Symmetry: C3
Subunit: 469 residues, 3 copies
Amino acid sequence: DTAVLVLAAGPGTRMRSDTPKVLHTLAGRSMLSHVLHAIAKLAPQRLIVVLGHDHQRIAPLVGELADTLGRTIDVALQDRPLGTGHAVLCGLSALPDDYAGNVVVTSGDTPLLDADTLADLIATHRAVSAAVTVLTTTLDDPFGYGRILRTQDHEVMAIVEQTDATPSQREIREVNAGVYAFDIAALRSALSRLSSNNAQQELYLTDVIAILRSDGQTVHASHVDDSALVAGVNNRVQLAELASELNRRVVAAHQLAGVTVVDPATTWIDVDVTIGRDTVIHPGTQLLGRTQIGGRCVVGPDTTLTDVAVGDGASVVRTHGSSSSIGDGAAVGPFTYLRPGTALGADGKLGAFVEVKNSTIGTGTKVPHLTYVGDADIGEYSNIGASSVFVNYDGTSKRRTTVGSHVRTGSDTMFVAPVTIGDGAYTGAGTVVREDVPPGALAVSAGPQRNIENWVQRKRPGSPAAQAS
Amino acid sequence: DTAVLVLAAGPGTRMRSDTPKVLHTLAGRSMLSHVLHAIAKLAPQRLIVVLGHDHQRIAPLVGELADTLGRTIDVALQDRPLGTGHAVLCGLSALPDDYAGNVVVTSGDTPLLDADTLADLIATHRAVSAAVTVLTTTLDDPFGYGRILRTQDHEVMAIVEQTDATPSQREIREVNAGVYAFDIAALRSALSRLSSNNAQQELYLTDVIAILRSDGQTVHASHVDDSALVAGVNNRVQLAELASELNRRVVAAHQLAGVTVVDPATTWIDVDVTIGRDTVIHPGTQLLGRTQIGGRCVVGPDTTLTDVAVGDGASVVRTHGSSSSIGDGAAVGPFTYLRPGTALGADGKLGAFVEVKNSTIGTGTKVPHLTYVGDADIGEYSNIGASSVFVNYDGTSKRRTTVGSHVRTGSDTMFVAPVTIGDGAYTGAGTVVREDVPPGALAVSAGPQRNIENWVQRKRPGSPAAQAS
Amino acid sequence: DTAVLVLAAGPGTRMRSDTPKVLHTLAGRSMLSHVLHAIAKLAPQRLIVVLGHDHQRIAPLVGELADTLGRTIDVALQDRPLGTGHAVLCGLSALPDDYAGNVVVTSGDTPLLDADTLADLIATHRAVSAAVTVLTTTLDDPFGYGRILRTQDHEVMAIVEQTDATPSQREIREVNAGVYAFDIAALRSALSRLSSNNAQQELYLTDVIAILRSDGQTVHASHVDDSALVAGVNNRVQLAELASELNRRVVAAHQLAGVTVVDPATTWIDVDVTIGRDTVIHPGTQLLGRTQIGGRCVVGPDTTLTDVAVGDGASVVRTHGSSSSIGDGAAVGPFTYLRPGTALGADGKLGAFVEVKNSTIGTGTKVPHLTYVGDADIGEYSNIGASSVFVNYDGTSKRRTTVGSHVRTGSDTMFVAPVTIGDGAYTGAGTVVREDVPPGALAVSAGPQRNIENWVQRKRPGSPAAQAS
Ligand SMILES: Nc1ncnc2c1ncn2[C@@H]1O[C@H](COP(=O)(O)OP(=O)(O)OP(=O)(O)O)[C@@H](O)[C@H]1O
Ligand SMILES: Nc1ncnc2c1ncn2[C@@H]1O[C@H](COP(=O)(O)OP(=O)(O)OP(=O)(O)O)[C@@H](O)[C@H]1O
Ligand SMILES: Nc1ncnc2c1ncn2[C@@H]1O[C@H](COP(=O)(O)OP(=O)(O)OP(=O)(O)O)[C@@H](O)[C@H]1O
Ligand SMILES: CC(=O)N[C@H]1[C@@H](OP(=O)(O)O)O[C@H](CO)[C@@H](O)[C@@H]1O
Ligand SMILES: CC(=O)N[C@H]1[C@@H](OP(=O)(O)O)O[C@H](CO)[C@@H](O)[C@@H]1O
Ligand SMILES: CC(=O)N[C@H]1[C@@H](OP(=O)(O)O)O[C@H](CO)[C@@H](O)[C@@H]1O
Ligand SMILES: CC(=O)N[C@H]1[C@@H](OP(=O)(O)O)O[C@H](CO)[C@@H](O)[C@@H]1O
Ligand SMILES: CC(=O)N[C@H]1[C@@H](OP(=O)(O)O)O[C@H](CO)[C@@H](O)[C@@H]1O
Ligand SMILES: CC(=O)N[C@H]1[C@@H](OP(=O)(O)O)O[C@H](CO)[C@@H](O)[C@@H]1O
Ligand SMILES: [Co+2]
Ligand SMILES: [Mg+2]
Ligand SMILES: [Mg+2]
Ligand SMILES: [Mg+2]
Ligand SMILES: [Mg+2]
Ligand SMILES: [Mg+2]
Ligand SMILES: [Mg+2]
Ligand SMILES: [Mg+2]
Ligand SMILES: [Mg+2]
Ligand SMILES: [Mg+2]
Ligand SMILES: [Mg+2]
């Protein structure tokens, strides 16, 4: 029986942001969302989020996650800038006064923390019958972390905060994770005893370690060797460094599952993205949101896809796209812009300097060059000529165009919506299509060529003129 | 006198791929190709590749490399999943029974191994009169390597494999390279004595160390301090990390030779690429295949070139190109797509949102904006207007267009192949060119402008209407 | 009272470049410019630059910086390849013979050196009454640095250069910064006593340490823990590594000030760039020269801006631009090329495959697709149709076009400069505009559509023909 408290009440002033700190994102989720996903997997009996600074902007998102995760998540409000020890006191208020389960506490800015680490914490805590178990780790740069203070017999005595540590204490590289399990009675007693004699004048939760030690209570540290799992974020530098570590691990899981990632350092992959076996991802690529890539694809370089579905054997190169689907064996790129609602069929092709928006494009159809396709349905095995525009917009309103199958439209055709081009139709180079075109018809509008001989000697005497001569 | 065996018979299941593991590439060559290039430089008397899993897909490529490298390379087949010790037994079958040279063994998944390291191994082995010399190194992360076991007098006694090592043995950071030299008689004797009592139930080649030691034979380790040279690849994570290390060294050799690489971490250069002095390469760039860049060029950012030749003093910026040539002093980019068969002359320019395919473009000629050039020959000092298309394709078949020198073609011209435009000709804005245009002629086809006054008050009463008013 | 000497007389042959070494750049400034900016902040009484190899190409830039920094900077010439000790002798010639201030010496290839480090050096030197104070640091890779030699009592005795060090001395990781403060009398005496018995046959300045020690003079080392601040550059590998370290620190200062940088490793920011709070910069981005970005912007990915001003709340995505301004709330990208003289108003939009050059574009105006805008002024709340060209160039000369407010121009319009389009005007799809268009007029020129029925059965019997049928 366990209640988990997430301390998320701090203003995060060190972030220098108007967006609440625990709402900043890495790998496609907020820090608070990462932490709550980890805890929901653990499935504790109670789950309490302590909010404070900006709680009105954050509490609605907690409600949304609770629904997403199918569990209730209680919010307790902290109403004074009085420290993490006070944040826990506020969290305990959302429990019955006679609650008797363990109390696990973690901060909302420890975004890599995982269900396995929390399960091991609770198991260790129960096993040693501790009044408090604290997670620690050891770091090359421990700046801003509480330092773990140990006796000669290597027994934990205290945690001293960065701003309160002597210069020698600062050299201590073993740090507090700020993740703990508590016997609830011992915890309640130690919190009433905290005072604020420290550089912040706050009630530090970390002081409960020395308080419990002094009461002859069992105090256990558990060393997490994989430091990233308990690393915190107090500023944008730390955020980007954990985002990078998280990203290296996401990429590694895909590489172990059969995805060639040429350059993990420049390949950003959000946590929900799936990628099929033998896909190759080239450098400078970000796969974001709920993107799904099939097997044997080629993606990148310099591609960004957000919520894009790509089938098997497709290539998607130097492409910026969102909310779109690319069928099996399709070729997209290089230099292609996909806007929401784009659906390209299997074996289709969207080539260089092409943009598509809210259009359906059939099996085997190709739009290879310098073209805008907006609000259009195109059939199968058609070919749209270079430098064409689906003119959806008449200055005030937008309309659909329908192009059939096996069509071959000429370069520099304008399709002035609404118009329909029937199956197997053609248009000439340079055509402005304003009326329906029957199946098997050729539609044209360009006037005839006239050559004006010796124009250049007459109007440009000197340069093309010489050489004409 | 030396025979070299390359063990390449493993399935590489940890790669999770349908492409045979030793065929995966880094810096433009397969792992197997890297290893064989290194060994061919050494020029041993015999060169034997042991294949096994997927040998039918791999053996043809060995034959091709043998021709490329101008030497014969024998293939021996391993027909049971029975371990590296069995792989060597299979390799020895391709030698005469009375062969008396040294036997050098390396694995096909040690892709940075180099001729110098192998020459030093053989020289050390001869110098100490060893029955076996093994290369070792020391690593921060030795996961999956055999650990080197030494006596108190620092004498090598055994190699223990990752899956067979005690927890304390696993902490050993000195690892087996899997690169060895052998006295052939001692090797044959130790291989007949191997048994398979280990976590894989295989005949481990690494057991020959302890077997030879126990026979009172001289067993020498040689420590290679530069670990990357003997690092192995068993999965895609390791592959990308060695590809990155190899790439850092290729870039460093160019930087030492006089190439400014702004950001080596995002500049990927294949092993055969050459680059001239005082070229500057900007971030996000990959130079691949047999690309050659002259001196005093500017390349990047975000450029990918595969088998592209670029002369001196050229700039090639935000360009995706292959199988093409760019003359001296030419400007390509930003946002330019070069397809095979593109040849741009000296001082030529291919600008933004331009794609060229299978076309020759003369000295000093410029195609600066929003244009597709396909199957065309253009002369010198010509200027192709913005938003033009060389219409090579009539719906079924493709044709050539010829444009001469000192031509000035108008924006929005379509060149409907086959057509010829003579020297110093012009075309008007908006022309569809379907017939030959004489030298010094102006070709036109756009109809005259008509202004329909007060159209907007009549047809859009409200917005542009207000403001017209 | 202090005179600072900057030794910048070496040829930098290890750079392999025709551009003088101290003129190579990082973060938007030459190494020599970084060093002189640092020293000017310190504001010493005298500032002497010793030049030598290529002094005629470098001295003018020293003069320019002197003006920029508002102080006089003397240049002394070194006329023999005779070593850093000789370089200091040459520098001293620019001082009066009875000068009695401290002499600080640093090299022109220590580009991260900062005013604080130099102030601390001078303060330490005065405090210990040293004849010489030398800055040292300790490095993982000390290759090519002088090694610091210390007695058992940890007293500095000598500096030994890389090319002169025994193998054991080479293992020394404590290195010479080549930054010193001197008592002038002691310095003059030690320099006259140098000889050239070393691997370069030069007068090494570093020998003055042992000379002063042997005279019973006070010799102080001051250890700079932050090594990058005193790291040198002798080749392109070192240059790129310090450029990367400098870049990590510039990015970190923006992150601490409130800028989200998703990926500091692929985000390059020059030293003078300013960025507003809550801007997010996506990967693959370089901000260069005097770029200024407002707050709450989105920049990147794959964006390069040089001297571009961007207002608040703007987005600038996959954009290559220079010498341009982007107003508040404007949207630029993806795939957009801005050339000098581009000014986009607030809430304006330049979309995919758009290039603008020397044009002013009013509040709320949009050029969203496949368009070139050159030498044009466009008013407010106008909409330029897809695939249009502002034809500025008639084959010989360039002209301006003026488009008013609330205009709606049709796709595939050519604007043949000089032309004016009045407020609230329209043009039709496919129009070639050669004459002025009154306010509220519709200008057109495309001929009428004709459908040629059954063309395809007749001219392509087979494929679109079948399916027409
Ligand atoms: N405005 C506040 N409202 C509610 N609780 C607060 C507030 N300020 C501080 N606290 C409590 O005190 C603890 C420490 O506060 P502090 O101001 O150091 O927050 P931080 O977010 O950790 O750091 P900073 O804001 O300095 O970057 C917070 O975690 C929170 O529990
Ligand atoms: N299917 C096989 N055919 C031929 N030889 C094999 C086969 N399987 C294994 N072997 C031999 O046994 C050795 C060890 O085999 P193992 O299956 O561990 O191969 P691996 O490629 O090293 O690893 P994995 O396939 O587990 O990633 C291989 O190097 C090879 O010599
Ligand atoms: N051609 C020269 N002109 C003037 N002074 C020189 C010249 N060559 C060397 N010196 C002096 O001798 C010192 C050492 O010279 P060296 O040739 O090692 O220069 P470097 O730039 O440090 O190295 P390298 O050129 O070997 O990369 C230089 O710093 C300079 O003071
Ligand atoms: C008083 C207190 O709770 N301090 C904790 C807490 O610090 P913050 O300054 O609140 O971020 O979280 C750190 C872990 O992220 C931990 O090391 C430290 O001990
Ligand atoms: C070819 C075309 O006319 N596209 C129009 C049209 O683009 P969309 O792709 O629907 O966003 O609507 C825009 C206004 O919503 C206008 O800016 C643009 O010119
Ligand atoms: C039994 C055997 O040969 N094991 C070798 C061999 O391991 P693999 O598991 O086969 O990749 O290659 C490693 C070097 O890449 C070496 O460390 C190890 O000892
Ligand atoms: C300007 C033009 O008409 N280009 C044609 C033409 O492009 P290529 O550059 O030759 O691949 O052939 C294609 C079919 O092979 C067709 O998809 C396209 O529309
Ligand atoms: C004789 C001399 O002055 N050597 C100095 C000097 O070396 P160079 O080889 O001149 O770059 O600068 C180094 C610091 O960048 C310093 O470590 C070394 O001691
Ligand atoms: C639309 C147009 O005609 N642009 C012309 C025009 O481009 P600029 O953007 O001014 O550089 O001048 C160029 C010669 O200076 C010529 O190459 C090009 O074709
Ligand atoms: Co047209
Ligand atoms: Mg505070
Ligand atoms: Mg605080
Ligand atoms: Mg914190
Ligand atoms: Mg196996
Ligand atoms: Mg195995
Ligand atoms: Mg292996
Ligand atoms: Mg020299
Ligand atoms: Mg030298
Ligand atoms: Mg130097
Ligand atoms: Mg057009």
